Write a protein that binds this ligand. Structure first.
Ligand SMILES: *[C@@H]1O[C@H](CO[C@@H]2O[C@@H](C)[C@@H](O)[C@@H](O)[C@@H]2O)[C@@H](O[C@@H]2O[C@H](CO)[C@@H](O[C@@H]3O[C@H](CO[C@H]4O[C@H](CO)[C@@H](O)[C@H](O)[C@@H]4O[C@@H]4O[C@H](CO)[C@@H](O[C@@H]5O[C@H](CO)[C@H](O)[C@H](O)[C@H]5O)[C@H](O)[C@H]4NC(C)=O)[C@@H](O)[C@H](O[C@H]4O[C@H](CO)[C@@H](O)[C@H](O)[C@@H]4O[C@@H]4O[C@H](CO)[C@@H](O)[C@H](O)[C@H]4NC(C)=O)[C@@H]3O)[C@H](O)[C@H]2NC(C)=O)[C@H](O)[C@H]1NC(C)=O
Ligand SMILES: *[C@@H]1O[C@H](CO[C@@H]2O[C@@H](C)[C@@H](O)[C@@H](O)[C@@H]2O)[C@@H](O[C@@H]2O[C@H](CO)[C@@H](O[C@@H]3O[C@H](CO[C@H]4O[C@H](CO)[C@@H](O)[C@H](O)[C@@H]4O[C@@H]4O[C@H](CO)[C@@H](O[C@@H]5O[C@H](CO)[C@H](O)[C@H](O)[C@H]5O)[C@H](O)[C@H]4NC(C)=O)[C@@H](O)[C@H](O[C@H]4O[C@H](CO)[C@@H](O)[C@H](O)[C@@H]4O[C@@H]4O[C@H](CO)[C@@H](O)[C@H](O)[C@H]4NC(C)=O)[C@@H]3O)[C@H](O)[C@H]2NC(C)=O)[C@H](O)[C@H]1NC(C)=O
Lengths: 46, 210, 209, 29
């Protein structure tokens, strides 16, 4: 379990997103593999 | 000579906010009334694409037309270093002129963000400045703004990015507030958007300390 | 359209320090081989002066010459907003080209200078940022430099001057120093040169508390 | 009065009793 975000009971690990002044900036997920947040393109482009 | 071309990058806040729309803009000036006739070919990394807006032309009170073309760029493509080529063809050009742009090549570095209180010498005035130091970031495409109580503060200036010794950039953002807001104990936040930041966004708050 | 002309103003430090020589530079490019002869005429406020230096034409890699004329100017005329006029006349120029330039007009406003210590958060790093806010000044021609024990500290970078909303300019100057020097209470200084300042000069110092 | 920057003369003025200002002291420079 890393720093921040919320945990997805499914295969997916943790999910974070930043909001600037109500407006969405970006959203990542945690790679339990390389141990880095990678662009979550699902949520975003959705 | 002939028609000239000028290719322009998207606004950083556009490239970085996914919920926004970045675009490259290709402008063409010195088009003759003789040859009012102008074509554009766009290519995302040598692949061609056909979705650009071509604005109707404008007369330029200098007996010349200006024609702009606007390409929407995808956030993935732009951030991933992809190259955009504007090819302008005009029946008056020996060769179709070609311009090309892209995010700077180089490992993105995460900026450090520090807020700095007004100088003691300053608290004599009826308006103080709060300062946001943003340093060691690459590439230089960044956006900085201020806020307080979830409203944006709009009486601020940000300098342009400045190259440092270790090849990164820094800048400074200055917010001017009434001294009483500052001494009231109000909390103000400096927000930064840049690609190497977690989720492209970071906020550092700043309020009277002792 | 053959030749092209550019007028460049003096360096801010050179206009400000009586002991440096300030000069306006006029540069003609795209000077054909076919027509090499170039005539420079200078006027301060529409009155011609005649001691400008014309560097011998030097050759460009695209088969064109470049010729530069350099006029050295009086610190006062420049600060008094006098107008420098360069007129380039060439045998292949439909008519002589004119470029004129000068300091910006506007009541000079003195800058306020504030030094600011490093962020506490920064004091985890092994290098720190000493900051110098300089604001309120006009026109934008300023020079800033840091020093300690009467020796120039050279690891500083300074911002171009930015236009504030009350129509003057401000800027920051960031000095990097080794934390240890800072913690040991050495005293550093931000030097500022600007016409609206008394004797064109002021200096502000900071050090730990 | 005169100001010095790293040993280099920057500028110098004197009081001109008339006006409330310090005019540029050309003699000294
Ligand atoms: C006939 O008249 C026309 C019409 O102009 C008008 O007439 C003139 C005489 C004026 O008096 C006035 O009446 C009118 O403006 C003349 O047209 C002009 O022609 C010249 C060329 O001769 C053009 O000059 C270039 O200028 C560029 C900057 O322009 C921008 O900034 C100014 C403000 O200062 C604006 O006025 C411009 O519109 C441009 O503004 C930008 O516009 C973009 C899109 O429109 C914006 O991007 C989009 O923006 C939106 C925001 O809403 C979104 O964010 C989108 O997502 C985004 O895509 C952008 O934000 C916006 N900025 C802003 C806020 O203004 C210069 O950049 C450029 O410089 C290059 O070349 C120069 C020499 O040619 C050189 O000096 C420069 O250094 C630079 O060189 C490049 O530099 C890099 C490295 O630095 C090198 O690596 C490159 O290789 C190098 N190139 C070279 C040298 O090869 C141009 O010089 C002028 O802009 C143009 N007018 C307009 C408005 O189009 C015409 O000349 C006349 N001719 C005759 C017959 O007399
Ligand atoms: C063939 O080659 C030649 C030579 O070029 C070579 O190219 C290749 C081959 C390279 O390999 C290399 O060999 C050469 O580069 C070509 O000639 C070029 O032609 C273009 C345009 O046609 C010129 O472009 C102008 O450049 C201006 C900036 O130039 C300076 O900075 C560049 C760096 O990019 C230097 O390389 C230049 O030398 C200039 O350098 C400055 O030089 C000064 C004097 O030497 C210095 O100041 C003095 O310095 C000393 C210190 O030692 C003292 O301190 C003195 O006190 C002081 O006076 C100065 O410090 C130094 N600067 C620095 C820090 O580097 C551009 O500004 C200019 O753009 C203006 O015009 C545009 C026109 O549309 C306009 O859009 C722009 O906005 C811009 O600005 C404005 O202009 C308009 C007028 O139109 C005004 O009305 C506006 O209000 C004004 N706004 C403001 C506020 O600015 C041009 O782009 C280029 O300079 C020239 N190159 C060289 C080297 O001279 C030639 O074209 C080629 N042939 C062919 C066939 O094409």
């Amino acid at each position: 379990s890393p720093g921040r975000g919320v945990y997805d009971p499914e295969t997916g690990t943790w999910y974070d997103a930043a909001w600037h002044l109500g407006e969405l900036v970006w959203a990542t997920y945690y790679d339990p593999e390389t141990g880095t947040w990678e662009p979550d393109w699902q949520r975003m482009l959705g | 000579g002939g028609p000239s071309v000028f290719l322009f990058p998207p606004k950083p806040k556009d490239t970085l906010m996914i919920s926004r729309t970045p675009e490259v803009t290709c402008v063409v000036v010195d088009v003759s009334h003789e040859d009012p006739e102008v074509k554009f070919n766009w290519y995302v990394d040598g692949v061609e694409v056909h979705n650009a807006k071509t604005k109707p032309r404008e007369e330029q009170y200098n007996s010349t037309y200006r024609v702009v073309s606007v390409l929407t760029v995808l956030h993935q493509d732009w951030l991933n270093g992809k190259e955009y080529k504007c090819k302008v063809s005009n029946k008056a050009l020996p060769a179709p002129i070609e311009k090309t742009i892209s995010k700077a090549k180089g490992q993105p570095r995460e900026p450090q963000v520090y807020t700095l209180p007004p100088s003691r010498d300053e608290l004599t005035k009826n308006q103080v400045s709060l300062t946001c130091l943003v340093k060691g970031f690459y590439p230089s495409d960044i956006a900085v703004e201020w806020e307080s109580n979830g409203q944006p503060e709009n009486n601020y200036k940000t300098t342009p990015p400045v190259l440092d010794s270790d090849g990164s950039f820094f800048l400074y953002s200055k917010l001017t507030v009434d001294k009483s807001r500052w001494q009231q104990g109000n909390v103000f936040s400096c927000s930064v958007m840049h690609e190497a930041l977690h989720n492209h966004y970071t906020q550092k708050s700043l309020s009277l300390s002792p």
